Amino acid sequence: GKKKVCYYYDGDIGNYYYGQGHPMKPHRIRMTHNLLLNYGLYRKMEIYRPHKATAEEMTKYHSDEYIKFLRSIRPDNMSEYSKQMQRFNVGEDCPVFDGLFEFCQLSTGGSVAGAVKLNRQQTDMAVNWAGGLHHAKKSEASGFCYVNDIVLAILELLKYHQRVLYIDIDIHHGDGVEEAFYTTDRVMTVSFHKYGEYFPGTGDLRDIGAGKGKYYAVNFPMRDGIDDESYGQIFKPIISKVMEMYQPSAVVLQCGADSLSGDRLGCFNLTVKGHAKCVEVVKTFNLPLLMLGGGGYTIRNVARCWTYETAVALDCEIPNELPYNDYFEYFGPDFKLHISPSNMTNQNTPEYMEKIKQRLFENLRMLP
Ligand SMILES: O=C(CCCCCCC(=O)Nc1ccccc1)NO
Ligand SMILES: [Ca+2]
Ligand code: NA
Ligand SMILES: [Zn+2]
Numbered sequence: 001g002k003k004k005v006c007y008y009y010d011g012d013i014g015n016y017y018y019g020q021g022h023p024m025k026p027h028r029i030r031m032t033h034n035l036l037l038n039y040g041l042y043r044k045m046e047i048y049r050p051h052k053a054t055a056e057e058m059t060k061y062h063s064d065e066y067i068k069f070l071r072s073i074r075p076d077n078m079s080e081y082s083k084q085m086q087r088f089n090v091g092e093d094c095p096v097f098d099g100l101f102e103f104c105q106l107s108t109g110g111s112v113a114g115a116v117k118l119n120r121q122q123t124d125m126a127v128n129w130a131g132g133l134h135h136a137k138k139s140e141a142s143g144f145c146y147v148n149d150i151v152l153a154i155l156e157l158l159k160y161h162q163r164v165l166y167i168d169i170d171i172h173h174g175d176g177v178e179e180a181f182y183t184t185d186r187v188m189t190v191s192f193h194k195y196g197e198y199f200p201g202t203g204d205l206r207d208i209g210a211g212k213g214k215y216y217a218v219n220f221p222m223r224d225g226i227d228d229e230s231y232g233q234i235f236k237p238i239i240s241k242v243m244e245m246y247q248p249s250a251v252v253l254q255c256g257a258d259s260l261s262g263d264r265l266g267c268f269n270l271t272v273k274g275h276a277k278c279v280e281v282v283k284t285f286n287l288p289l290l291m292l293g294g295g296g297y298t299i300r301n302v303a304r305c306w307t308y309e310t311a312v313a314l315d316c317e318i319p320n321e322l323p324y325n326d327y328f329e330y331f332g333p334d335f336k337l338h339i340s341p342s343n344m345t346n347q348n349t350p351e352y353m354e355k356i357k358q359r360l361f362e363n364l365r366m367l368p
Contacts, residue, residue, distance in 0.1 A: 002315045003124035003283075005045040006117050008110030009033050013130050016103040019095050023264055023297045024144040026103065029130050031303035031327045036310050038323040044314045050109030050128070052102060053152070057112060061151045061180065066139040070101050070146060094141035104147040107131050111149035111292060115156035118250060118288040125289045125313050129306050132254040132292030134174040135200060143172065143200060144295075150252060151180045153290055154187055157250045161288075165248035166190065167239065169278050170256020170294040171266045173203030173219065177254075183213040188246050192235070192259075194267055195221030205356060208363055215366045218242070220356055223347035224267040226259075228274030230348050234357045236281050241360075243285055245367040251287050253279065256294025257305040261341045264297035269341045272305045279312045300330040304337050 014030025036042070058067045069084050078085070078096050085091045097103075107130045114126025131153070133145035150166070154177070157164045166181075168174035168191040181187035193203050209217035220234065258266040260275055282289060291313060296302035311318045322328070322335045 003313070005125045005127060005310075005313050006048060006114065006123040007045050007127040007310065008048050008050045008114055009130070010049050010106045010110075013103070013106055016097065016099050018097055018144070022095065025297075025299055026130070028296060028299040028302040029293070031299060031330065032129050032306040034326045035303050035307040035322070038325040039307060039311065039318050041307075041310055041314065041316065041318075044316055045310075046123075048113065050106060050113045052105035053108035053112055053147075054105075057152065058104075058108060058147055060155050061138060061148060062136075063139040070104060073100065074098070089140045089142055090146075093143055094146060100146065107133060108147050108149040108152055111153035111290065112156055114290050115153040118290060119157065119160045125291060127291045127310060127313060129293040132170070132256060132294035134168060134170065134254055134256075134294060135172070135176045137176050137179060142176065145176065148176050148180070150177050150254060150292060153292075154181070154252055157252070157290070158186060161248070161250040162186065163188070163246060163248040165242065165246060165251045166254070167251065167278075167282060168192065168254040168256070169259055169275065170254055171259040171263070171268050172199055172256065172295060174254060175200050175202045178203070178207070178217050181213065182209055182217060183211040185212050185216045188216045188218065188242065188248065190218040190238070190242060192220040192231075193222060194224065195219075196223070205359060215363055218360055218363065220360060222268075223352070225269045225344045225346040226348045227269045227341055227346050228271055228277070230346060230350070230353050231270060231274055232277055233350065233353050235278055237357060238360060239281055241364050245364050248287065250289070251282055251285070252290045252292065253282050254292045254294050255279065255306065255309055257296030257302040258294070260296070260298070260301050260305060261339060261344075262298050262301060265295070266297070269344050269346065271339050271341055272301070272308050273338060275305055276309050276312050279309045283313070301339060303327070303330070304339065308337060
């Protein structure tokens with residue numbers, strides 16, 4: 001049936017600035033919010049302002065030393081932390097910016113609050129577009145991510161759920177999440193990503209987990225230019241097999257929008273409909289679902305993607321003609337919600353797609 005959706009957003013989020021030339025723009029979360037408000041989606045869901053996650057919350061995963069450094073580091077005292085910055089990988093991809101810790105606290109707070117809401121059985125779905133920062137490690141920032149809100153949200157879910165399924169549709173491999181749960185069968189991690197001389201360099205299909213976690217990490221490595229047809233060819237069959245074999249009681253879906261056509265950093269060719277079909281596929285399983293953000297660098301397309309995926313979560317049809325909004329000029333020259341794929345070559349042949357799927361199916365046969 002139609003589901004109860006709780007959505008997390010803090011109006012301050014859009015003001016956090018990574019710095020001149022940095023592609024990660026928290027402003028895209030505000031654009032997403034303003035667009036979905038203008039479509040009238042607030043009438044169908046509960047809108048919550050997340051709390052600022054504390055150090056006690058963050059240290060359920062991250063080390064005390066790393067969190068203390070994030071809590072202390074500022075552009076004014078940077079010069080006194082040169083060594084600490086190199087140790088925790090802060091300074092280039094993961095810059096020090098005003099309000100960095102507070103940005104982490106709000107990104108994390110939405111994911112953790114959403115997980116609590118699902119655990120209490122007070123919502124069917126929880127949405128946190130400021131979350132999904134999949135690369136952060138126990139004691140290290142990485143790929144524009146500092147605090148792993150996903151790992152913290154899954155640890156919250158594990159209090160009430162024996163098995164939690166994690167699915168990652170961002171163009172980049174969900175390394176941080178896969179790493180945290182690599183040796184456990186209590187979380188199965190499933191990542192679809194561009195692989196081969198691409199950030200972060202991990203997610204080979206041969207990386208399948210270790211110890212009790214062997215066969216509980218799934219990687220689908222892809223080439224440049226994947227399209228809606230090819231993605232759709234494998235996503236439903238793989239998720240269906242995962243659901244059948246793994247039988248999770250809760251799901252976390254990372255919806256990184258950098259897998260869309262025309263992304264500033266991405267090299268895929270999905271449309272918003274192709275991306276959102278993933279949400280529709282996961283939705284059909286009727287399991288408690290936490291939907292998260294992630295990458296996404298062509299901000300107009302990020303706002304379109306996450307607005308449509310919120311409408312999909314709500315089973316609410318919305319017009320293709322964009323309503324007026326505070327960022328209306330960003331959506332030109334068309335002013336439409338949906339996007340067209342580019343003429344880029346799809347390097348993922350149908351044979352390649354079927355072969356990787358068959359290899360992953362062999363691995364899934366190894367589950368109890
Ligand atoms: O989307 C991501 C993170 C991608 C991180 C890519 C790191 C390399 C990079 O492009 N860094 C960079 C570029 C311009 C300015 C500063 C850093 N994960 O899902
Ligand atoms: Ca991914
Ligand atoms: Na695992
Ligand atoms: Zn990404």
